[PDB]
Symmetry: D2
Subunit: 280 residues, 4 copies
């Protein structure tokens, strides 16, 4: 219920004249707040009724309600991240909102899991000699986070957010190897180049992205993580938490597939840190 977020999100459901209003509001909400209905209509180039229909369309009671809720909407934080933050919010408010939104998104992802696709992804990785993680920006951090979990699972794990390294590494994969392309939009152009090179190498392509995206269409195994975070507009935040939890399921699954031999391997890995960390 940040009204500016709500407007951006319902642009598609709007009549053509009303969308003109929506985009003008999104562009300079503070000028609207001090505008008359006639000024706004003239600035946007629509009729005054179109203004009021827009207001009712986005769930306001009329013009004054729009201006009131716009004023309550002007929290710089609400343009940083897709959380319903209001102008007056204190840390007590937005810290809980952020946690609650993240908890809700994770609960939704959990509810919509394609368990079969997880099984298939786990099995492909468990038979691979190499697993590679590819992504950019936020998804590049997820890639590196994943490599840190997976390197200990008795295979060779690597992560790259450099598209040239991705392409060159992808063509060296064997058909039994696995690449995981990570993308909240499924639309990063360099990543589609990389994904095609993985396919042409014969290797298994796991896509950690929403369904029906260009990236998902290339997948050997599509994990179909449909987190609703509009990262054409907001900083990716909730989306990369969901990705990391899915990564943890894949790692756990691969660990399950290893023998009892894994335990002593992991003891060795943990023992190597003794010199670097103070004892408890």
């Amino acid at each position: 219920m940040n009204l500016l977020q709500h407007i951006a999100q319902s642009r598609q459901q709007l009549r053509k004249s009303e969308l003109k209003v929506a985009d003008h509001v999104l562009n300079d909400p503070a000028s609207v707040m001090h505008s008359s209905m006639a000024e706004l209509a003239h600035g946007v180039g629509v009729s005054e009724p179109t203004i009021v229909r827009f207001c009712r369309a986005i769930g306001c009671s009329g013009f004054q309600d729009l201006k009131l809720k716009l004023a309550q909407s002007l929290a710089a934080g609400a343009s940083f991240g897709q959380f319903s933050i209001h102008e007056s919010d204190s840390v007590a408010d937005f810290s809980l909102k952020i946690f609650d939104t993240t908890l809700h998104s994770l609960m939704e992802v959990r509810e919509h899991l394609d368990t079969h696709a997880l099984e298939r992804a786990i099995a492909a990785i468990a038979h691979a000699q190499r697993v590679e993680f590819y992504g950019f920006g936020a998804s590049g951090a997820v890639a590196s986070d994943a490599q840190h979990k997976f390197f200990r699972l008795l295979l060779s794990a690597a992560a790259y957010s450099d598209p040239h390294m991705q392409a060159m590494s992808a063509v060296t994969l064997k058909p039994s190897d696995v690449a995981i392309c990570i993308s909240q939009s499924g639309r990063s152009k360099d990543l589609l180049i990389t994904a095609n090179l993985v396919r042409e190498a014969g290797a298994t392509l796991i896509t950690l992205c929403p369904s029906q995206t260009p990236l998902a269409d290339l997948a050997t195994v599509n994990l179909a993580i449909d987190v609703h975070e509009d990262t054409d507009i907001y900083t990716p935040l909730t989306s990369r938490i969901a990705h990391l939890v899915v990564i943890d399921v894949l790692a756990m699954g691969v660990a399950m597939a290893r023998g009892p031999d894994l335990v002593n391997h992991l003891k060795s890995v943990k023992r190597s840190l003794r010199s670097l960390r103070l004892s408890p």
Copy 2:
């Protein structure tokens, strides 16, 4: 209720003779499963009653229950991550367990937040020219994830998991600048060196770690994130999710502190990706 996890966790609550049993069990649970009570007692060097007291101490009904629950405990995944996974679990089981455990930990962190410490951390960062994120391993990935969120907030943001880069960068900080040291154990030795250099520079040290740890003792602002994940034994997983959500609260708080000027800055940042990402 993975019995091997439960044993490792309750070592401290045990009588001295019983702890001998605990450590022998943790070291080779499969030999115990095919041992008689007399064999085990002889192998550990304790009395047979000490065996049965150990069993009752960790909540088993007796010796046979121990062996039964040990057999149910031998899931290689349960030594990879601190999730109550059993030998027989399928993806349907451990995927939900992993999500549920993560949701629970986040709910606990949310419940225990020191809101005042958040306000103080947000305020220090909001007045800084530089914010730097320091950590190793899993906390190094969190550091880089954070730098990707913060670079857009009208300050200079950097992350380092190289301790030499950390030390050299820390001494160049001004008193108004901020460093965030990230650590699930609070005991990484190089990070304590870095934290001391931040203090000696006069800058604000924010520690994203549990309370009562060596790192927390150095903090200007201790965030006191007491996620219960034993990373001397298990892969850090749930702990780094909590850290990232706390990072998101700090970023949101800093964004709130910026003017309405931030919105157009973030529009520019998002607009720069248009050439790199397919349109929706």
Copy 3:
């Protein structure tokens, strides 16, 4: 005088029929070595005289000389790097060849330096608050190497080989800031996107690449580093050494521009390493 390298390099100077021969030879030199002149001509689809003209064109005395020098050419190393390595070479041979080639290239770069362009690059960086280094692959390593030299020079220094991070960071630059795009080909597509964003931000674009390339055409200051290494074919090696030495000149120049204040700043930086390094 690796004949296969020599052939690839003189493709442009060749008659049309002869180029057919060149490309067939480059593709499978071992089959040529056991071919008759008539077999080769038939396989390539040219006349036998075209074979012999090709041989004389690339400086062989005739067909037998071609086959002899092809056999001497089959050193897997000579396809890895642009060094005149022969099939029979030992470490004593190719270690000196590699050093000598690198020394020669550096001497050539030194001889062709545009000293004025260096002065202008140094001056722009010396007045910047931020300097950023952008490149991919080998040039991404150069970028990170540079950031490690420059962070101590009383400005904010960053390096990115992720094109999404590059674009988002570039649009946040001020007109007084500086970006250095590093490229041996001057033709990396994502880097041209980044370079255009730097220009549109008003900032100074320094290009560390050959003259007359697409990247150089965008430059505010083109450093015109015309190292002759064909990185469409060979691993970049000599090119990135030259780039790093040029980077060192720029850093030295910026250091010269700082006050006597810099000395105590650098003492602090070096002092921060005392805990991390054993005393001498």
Copy 4:
């Protein structure tokens, strides 16, 4: 012949009283330049003859020559890097000095190569499934540069400047695997921990560092790269160029060891970049 560099370098050859003078001069050369002989002697707490003996010891003709050459010495660049830069130098001067110094150091390294140690290092890497590169700071950039050269040579290549990642990765190495620890000082404490873990894993430890250092003492194969750059005082510059050229020799050697199969592998790697780079 930067006098301050010369003084720092000849501290060891000095009489005890004279060293007091040396360290006072190094600490505040500008106060010395405006001091009388009596003032300086009093400030340092030595006799006036000790002043003049110090001057003659470092090759000055007397007190006035010291002050003259100190004034010529105050180039902030000369404390940044170990190049004989003077206060009056222009880009034309220090660009050539930097190239010439680098060329000289490379020529010295070339002259002192232990060719046998190179052969042994090449052979160990050529039989490895994994090669890992470990270093910090400047040597961490060298490590990542190396991984970019080596990943294409039909083995698994990784680089780490995070000491925790180094330790955990090192203990997972097999005896046939190889780690290369890179260090200009040979004294980085975390790197000695990593090197010991490599030895205890049974793997081959190649040290790319000077002889007679703590790191070199651990080596399976010591490459003995005795570049004279004092990185307790100066930015590492010339040292990391030498390391990278040695890395190139090792890569070339490993490429030589691969079949003729490597050529088509490298064609594939280079072909993967076609979509990412504009055609020539």
